[PDB]
Design a protein around this ligand. Structure first.
Ligand SMILES: Nc1ncnc2c1ncn2[C@@H]1O[C@@H](COP(=O)(O)OP(=O)(O)O)[C@@H](O)[C@H]1O
Ligand SMILES: Nc1ncnc2c1ncn2[C@@H]1O[C@@H](COP(=O)(O)OP(=O)(O)O)[C@@H](O)[C@H]1O
Lengths: 615, 618
């Protein structure tokens, strides 16, 4: 009680209050609606101020208003851990009364309504309709605990204000009840009153429950809005069917979910989250910015159907709903996109989703396959679009490769390294327009012969993904379509040779069309085969430019020939200039079609071969 | 004045009105705001009722409220072609007074406010405001739909008694004639009235027109002048705007910075009523090919903004069209939902689609240079049209453009007209090839004969073409046929000297292959291609199969018809060889050879090659 002060006005102010407050005499019970409300606005206000300077919570997350009693000293004590008032605030609000109150009262005065008639609303001072001493202790978030404020009043023209201390933020309204009004010590009656409000109110209202049992008299706090909330009953009450049914409902889909993660986070930010992974990518999947899924609730209340915001694009299949508290109701997409809390909440959830997937892949690779069937093409965005997890994503990735004679893709990157052979340092992949070309490329035949596992990438986004996905578990990625100096020496030497003459003859004949001509011990039954390395525009990269419809960039190709194949030698020998020309030409076109895939003239190659057969 | 009747309900009602109406005495001018408003709600109400039963307009589109005078009989006549009242309506509204008026007046009564001073300028009376400056209000009105004889008359002195009578007026709406009071000559000044009304007109919903006369050209004219002018670059008619002005505009309302290739800006009076301005961009933006999101059309209502961007007034195959349409008589407050419930949408859409297509046709008459740039940018979209909007499949197909034999540039510039134009005598059909790429098209086996005789063939290389054709059936009397399907029309179409017949050969291939090819034949598709494979017979065509492939379903079985060229080396040379293994190798090489040239993306270039390998090795 330091710095005490009585501010203590007069005359028929003393009277005026014994007027208005008494006007409410018909529906006294109002004073609850009014006080409970104030406690709401308190919290939500604090919530909002905590979108920013995070430490405004001082740790304690749960915001609640608690109604307690004393059938002894006959007190009814409403208290909230809201934002609370400072000293000035106190004296300027509690100090005065209710601007809207007096106002609508005054302009009401003297009208038939006014004179001959419960129609009204005073404010905070409503309390004095059932109290004869209102005693406020409070301290406002942020302020050192010593900056508390005391406010007693008789509900006349004079109140007392004093600096106190309380090591626990919020507002403690202690009503000293009047003779007669014992009706408001019935924790029931209070309950039943407040219940009508609590479906507009913004806050947990907890009521003191003194129930005696075991001989020992316990006091619980009973939240009077239990909340019909299938994402509230913890993971040990719910049926797998219950979950399934739920997702069904809030998805307008009717297949079962493949899996779900439903958790509850206390602490920094505070929220109950439930997420599903569907089994059937809907229609909209690959259209529009419209991403749906996440329903955002605030305080077990509905805000918006659907924010794409708490989900990164490469998981825009995730359905479900997150239910925040400590996110201020009234929030909307804009407001979120201005706060940081969004950034954080997003990231956390992304973790939760990825985990949920990892586990699905441990526990039911049957179902999980069905997942990757449905969504893999989306998850393959991930690596380009959230480096912070490029690991825990890549694991989730799945591929088709050499050691699997099936279009379907089921190869884990783990499953790759696992059955890697001793000494093998790199992870090899081919990138073609189609599974076909992949499985059956010239670049394949050696590795496929030695048995080495090659990866079969047939989706256009792959030619994208790789550029970012660099290296898994210590083993970097390399591509068969790019002849390296590592495989350049993999066993083959007993009796060498040299077939220079016509290779310089091919070099001369072609000119700049191919950047180089060589032999290569890529001893596939394939005669000729064309590559490009040297940090130049790779072949599918070109096709990618084609596919986004820009000028297909020039390819610097490296013609390679197979010294151990019929047609290689047989053309190599012929000494007719016209015939030979026809032959090396047939060989190149042959290799081209096998690389550039969609050969921009299958006829032309054919026609050259036609003549080579005709004449 | 048929069926006349004087009703009145009395007492200190006669007095009560000389109370409230007189409460407004401070700001008499109010009676304008009030009447003008009523005329607004009138129109907009009618507008809304005309989202449905279309004929509610009786033709006449422009909705306006007109203030006229008479410095003679001292009348001020406000009139609207709004929705108007029926008889019951009259007696139930005009008949009584003002519910909100009396109400807020009553609960006001006896309070300090009420008592003192000119606070009496608080208790807002309604229609009856008129009697604050009138001493005789005379209403003639008839409500949309009702036969013109169901008009209603309503005179009143502004006491407790009004007269109502059935009259007739062959012109919908509400005619409020105020008989002005001694003193209040202030409201015959067409100016003062104007200047008053101007403050309102920025919330009002309607054209307010004032009677503006001048003895000019010797003669005294009466022009109706509108109060607001509207800063509206789509209002000044086509004879008051700069090509730069237009260009700048599109730029702005597109967030694009290239110039438009063309525009159509017109004004429709009549059934539905609206000023439309549309542009054809020069650069298809990013979003072009993937969004449940069209943009472009900005919908204004009464020179007011409604929504940025509707996709209901444009069909998909023109979703590049940018611009804005400005309806009147589309009821403001309308939104996508409401439109998609009305029919007016259906109609408005269709009309615009016409206007767009026309705008294009003309572009193709008057600057084929630019138009090419158009088709470069948007053709792939316009090629949806034929499958989408049968009602114009003509005026679309003309706009279509292709590459064909009688050019050898990848670029496509051939009008269908340009095709038939240089068709040869007797040639009845229009031929096309459908390949994965310009290459294959230009250089297909099916080509070489037609290309030799000189006959123009169409080179379709985009995947949607294999779609479009199925619907685009026949242009200007000449049906479409495809080279990839050997018909019995070209089957008989030059220099045939020595003739005979092979049979051991053809039947030996038939036996060797079995069911793999449905038939084996010769064909005078004579040219430097040996073997070539087709199918006809109303069976699954080749690209149709590829289309199933491309939507990723089980690639349906193709019933192929092997054909051979009796006049080519390799044809004969394999034909003669009598070794069973060698010959097998040869007919096999011939088939694989033809396959790759049809099925294009040959699902094993190696396999064909390997067969040829052996045919060269051993
Ligand atoms: N539990 C509370 N926590 C923080 N401020 C409160 C609390 N209860 C009342 N207040 C403050 O007092 C109110 C304003 O005072 P006033 O305008 O005089 O009307 P009244 O005091 O009746 O609500 C609220 O606006 C709020 O700022
Ligand atoms: N020009 C008008 N056209 C159609 N109805 C009108 C017109 N002017 C007044 N009304 C009708 O009369 C009004 C209702 O009457 P009422 O409730 O007694 O108040 P007031 O007559 O003063 O507007 C409007 O709601 C409207 O329906």
């Amino acid at each position: 009680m330091k710095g005490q002060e009585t501010r203590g006005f007069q005359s028929e102010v003393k009277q005026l209050l014994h007027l208005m407050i008494h006007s409410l005499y018909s529906n006294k019970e109002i004073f609850l609606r009014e006080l409970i409300s104030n406690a709401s606005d308190a919290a939500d206000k604090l919530r909002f101020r905590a979108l920013s300077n995070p430490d405004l919570y001082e740790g304690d997350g749960e915001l609640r208003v608690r109604v307690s009693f004393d059938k002894d000293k006959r007190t009814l004590t409403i208290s909230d851990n809201g934002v609370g008032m400072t000293r000035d605030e106190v004296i300027d609000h509690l100090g005065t009364i209710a601007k809207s109150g007096t106002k609508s009262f005054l302009e009401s005065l003297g009208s038939d309504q006014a004179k001959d008639s419960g129609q009204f609303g005073v404010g905070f001072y409503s309390a004095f309709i059932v109290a004869d001493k209102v005693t406020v202790r409070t301290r406002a978030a942020g302020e050192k605990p010593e900056n508390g404020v005391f406010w007693e009043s008789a509900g006349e023209g004079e109140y007392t204000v004093a600096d106190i201390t309380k090591e626990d933020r919020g507002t403690e309204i202690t009503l000293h009840l009047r003779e007669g009004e014992d009706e408001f010590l019935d924790d029931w009656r209070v309950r039943s009153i407040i219940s009508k409000y609590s479906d507009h109110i913004a806050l947990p209202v907890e009521i003191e429950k003194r129930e005696e049992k075991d001989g020992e008299t316990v006091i619980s706090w009973e939240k009077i809005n239990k909340a019909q909330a299938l994402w509230t009953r913890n993971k040990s009450e719910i049926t797998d069917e219950e979950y399934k049914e739920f997702y069904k409902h809030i998805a307008h889909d009717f297949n079962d979910p493949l899996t779900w993660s439903h958790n509850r986070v206390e602490g920094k930010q505070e929220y109950t989250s439930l997420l599903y992974i569907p089994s059937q990518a809907p229609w909209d999947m690959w259209n529009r910015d419209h991403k749906h899924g996440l329903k955002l609730y605030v305080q077990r209340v509905f805000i918006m159907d659907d924010a794409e915001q708490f989900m990164p694009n490469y998981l825009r299949f995730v359905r479900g709903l997150i239910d925040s508290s400590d996110l201020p109701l009234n929030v909307s997409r804009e407001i979120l996109q201005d706060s940081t809390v969004t950034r954080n909440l997003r990231n956390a959830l992304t973790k939760r989703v990825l985990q949920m997937l990892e586990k699905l892949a441990k526990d039911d690779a049957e179902k999980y396959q069905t997942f990757w069937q449905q969504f893999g093409l989306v998850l393959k965005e991930g690596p380009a679009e959230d480096f912070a997890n490029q690991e825990a994503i890549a694991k989730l990735l799945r591929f088709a490769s050499t050691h699997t004679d099936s279009s379907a893709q089921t190869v884990s990157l783990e499953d790759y390294v696992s059955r890697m052979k001793e000494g093998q340092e790199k992870i090899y992949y081919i990138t073609a327009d189609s599974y076909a070309a992949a499985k059956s490329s010239p670049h394949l035949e050696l590795l496929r012969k030695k048995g080495i596992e090659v990866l079969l990438l047939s989706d256009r986004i792959d030619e994208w993904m790789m550029n970012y996905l660099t290296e898994f578990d210590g083993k970097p990625f390399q591509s068969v379509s790019k002849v390296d100096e590592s495989l350049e020496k993999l066993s083959a030497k007993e009796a060498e040779k040299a077939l220079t003459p016509f290779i310089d003859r091919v070099k001369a004949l072609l000119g700049e069309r191919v950047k180089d001509v060589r032999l290569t011990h890529r001893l596939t039954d394939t005669p000729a085969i064309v590559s490009t390395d040297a940090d130049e525009m790779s072949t599918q990269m070109a096709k990618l430019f084609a596919a986004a419809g820009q000028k297909v960039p020039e390819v610097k190709y490296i013609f390679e020939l197979n010294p151990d194949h019929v047609l290689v030698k047989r053309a190599a020998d012929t000494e007719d200039e016209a015939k030979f020309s026809e032959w090396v030409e047939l060989l190149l076109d042959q290799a081209l079609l096998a690389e550039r895939g969609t050969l921009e003239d299958p006829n032309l190659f054919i026609r050259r071969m036609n003549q080579l057969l005709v004449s």
